[model samples]
Target chain A: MGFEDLVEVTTMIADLTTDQREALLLTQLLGLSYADAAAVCGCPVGTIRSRVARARDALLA
Target chain B: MGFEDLVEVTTMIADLTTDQREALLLTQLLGLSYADAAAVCGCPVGTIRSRVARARDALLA
Candidate 1:
């Protein structure tokens, strides 16, 4: 991707709350599985999934 | 951009710290005015601008 692409996304996720940002980063950036992302964020897997989904919606919106 | 485009951006910004993430999001994703973003992040307007600039550099790098 181009530099603009990188900046575009970075700026987007930066707007999220700490937990929501973490969930998005772990799953999308770090390529973590849902369970592993939960472990990292100290939340339940379902919560992680939900947060990631919401974070994505926020980013894309 | 497609789904991959969104995912690509999401993953890249996920690597930043809380402050950096917030800066990027406020400017790029949420389209916050710089002054408003500073208010949200509780930093000076200059700091917010610098952080967003730095975050963009990091993401692009």
Candidate 2:
């Protein structure tokens, strides 16, 4: 993506709650597995999956 | 950090639990604030802080 696109995305992420933003960063940006991301975040794998899904939806909305 | 240092650190991080490695990556590598990192990980700020600290110690040890 271009710098502007990155900036737009970063801004969108900034607008999200910490959990949503983090879910996107870890799963999307960092390419971590949901299990790995959940382990790192100290939450259930289901939570990570849900948060990532929600975050994407919010970003696309 | 240099590539070798990065590699060495990555190796050390690989030895840690996913939580520890991610803590270091978020706080040290990505330079996220403790509060921000905690929010992203869906944990207490103290947890993130402690994990980052332990990760550092492990890398330095």
Candidate 3:
């Protein structure tokens, strides 16, 4: 992956929902542990996991 | 561009500042219209645009 990879990924992320986006930012973007990210996002840990997984899936789509 | 793209992009975003991460979350991840994103981010639209663009650039780094 290179610069072009970055653009493509950014474009993909640019297409997620608000909750999914927040999950990605809290967990992946901000490097938060799943537990900590859940606290920051004010949701259940399971929800956080689901959202992050969903967000990842969105990028794959 | 596929699941690998998601992983690589998430990893890159995992390295941003709080504000930059927030910017990406609002504009890119959340699918906010630029204007709405500016409002949500509480910044000028230009700043939001720059942050989004810069965040994109960061993924390249």
Candidate 4:
């Protein structure tokens, strides 16, 4: 991505809810497993999965 | 601020703790009263005050 594209992507990521953002960051950017992301977020793996899914869909939309 | 300046400011704001960011936005940007901001964040007014203070200090620093 170009510099401006990186900036736009950052803005888009910041638009997500905190839970979704956290889940997406942990799973995608940090390359963590769902279980590991749940451990860090102090939530269930299922919750993390939903949050990541919603975040991804929102970004794709 | 200009466009790039606004982008930089947005980035700096994103660097703050989520609690701090919420407090700062509620109070500074949204022009909410301290009590209202606290209510929205579902925290004590003193906590909101401290969060805003910390956010401000961090941005200044």
Candidate 5:
């Protein structure tokens, strides 16, 4: 995707719940490990993983 | 600091160890809670706190 597209997608991501936004941004944009993202979110690693998965589905839908 | 200064500082952070960089990025750059950063780092919360502290000292020096 182009830079504009990337920004648009990011803006869309920002519309998600705070937890979902952070999960997607940390893993997808910032390239953080799932474990690290979980730490940042103060949630379980599984939660981070699941959030990312759910966010992906939402974004695709 | 201007954007350039911020870039320079981030570049310096890149020179740190992976653990140190991750801790600082999560807690400082990303505004994550210490508890969350610790979870992401897969360490005790104190370890994350100490790593961030050391990273800050190194950056200042």
Candidate 6:
């Protein structure tokens, strides 16, 4: 579900690793492309993709 | 730029209206389709799109 509860959602996000949290916030909240976020992280775009995917699963699941 | 700062980011998000915050979180953090989030909010998908776009601008700007 797209959560309405910030208390719970922020808690779920904190469960993510720092990298995962940055990836998710960059790509989603800031509307950055995965490639751009990758450059910010100095990592492969593929890793950003994985981080974003896992971040979503962690929050949404 | 994609932000790594949660303290600032959450504060920025709280500046959005409650509806805008919910739309942004649902679509971004929860990985819900815009249509799904629209349904959740009982609004049109177009409204959700604007909500998300503005929410991002608020945080990422």
Go through the candidates in order and give the C-alpha RMSD of each one to the true structure: 12.2, 14.6, 13.0, 13.9, 10.9, 6.1
Error of 3 at B12 (Å): 15
- Model 4: runs farther than 4 Å from truth? B1-61
TM-score-wise, the better of 5 and 6 is: 6
lDDT of 1 by residue, A1-61 (tens): 3345566666766778888898876876676889999998788999998886688567655
The DockQ values of the predictions, listed in order, are: 0.04, 0.04, 0.04, 0.02, 0.03, 0.16
Against the true structure, candidate 3 has what lDDT? 0.74
Error of 1 at A41 (Å): 39
User: How many steric overlaps are in each model, in order?
Assistant: 7, 0, 1, 0, 6, 0
Error of 3 at A17 (Å): 1.1
Q: What local lDDT does model 3 show for residue A34?
A: 86
Judged by lDDT, which candidate is best?
6
Where is model 3 more than 4 Å wrong at Cα? B1-61
Q: What is the TM-score of each candidate against the true structure?
A: 0.46, 0.47, 0.48, 0.48, 0.47, 0.57
Clashing pairs in 3: A29-B13
Identify the runs in model 5 with alpha carbons over 4 angstroms from their true place: A1-61, B1-4
Model 2: residues with Cα > 4 Å off, grouped in runs = A1-3, B1-61
Misplaced by over 4 Å in model 6 are: A1-21, A28-32, A36-61, B1-4
lDDT of 5 by residue, B1-61 (tens): 4999866765567666667776876665445679977876679999998998898887887
Look at candidate 1 and give me any clashing residue pairs.
Answer: A11-B24, A11-B25, A14-B21, A14-B22, A14-B25, A15-B25, A29-B11
> Model 1, stretches more than 4 Å misplaced?
A1-61, B1-5
Q: Which 10 successive residues of model 3 chain B have the least lDDT summed? A: B1-10
Q: In lDDT terms, how accurate is model 2?
A: 0.74
Q: TM-score of candidate 3's chain B against its reference?
A: 0.75
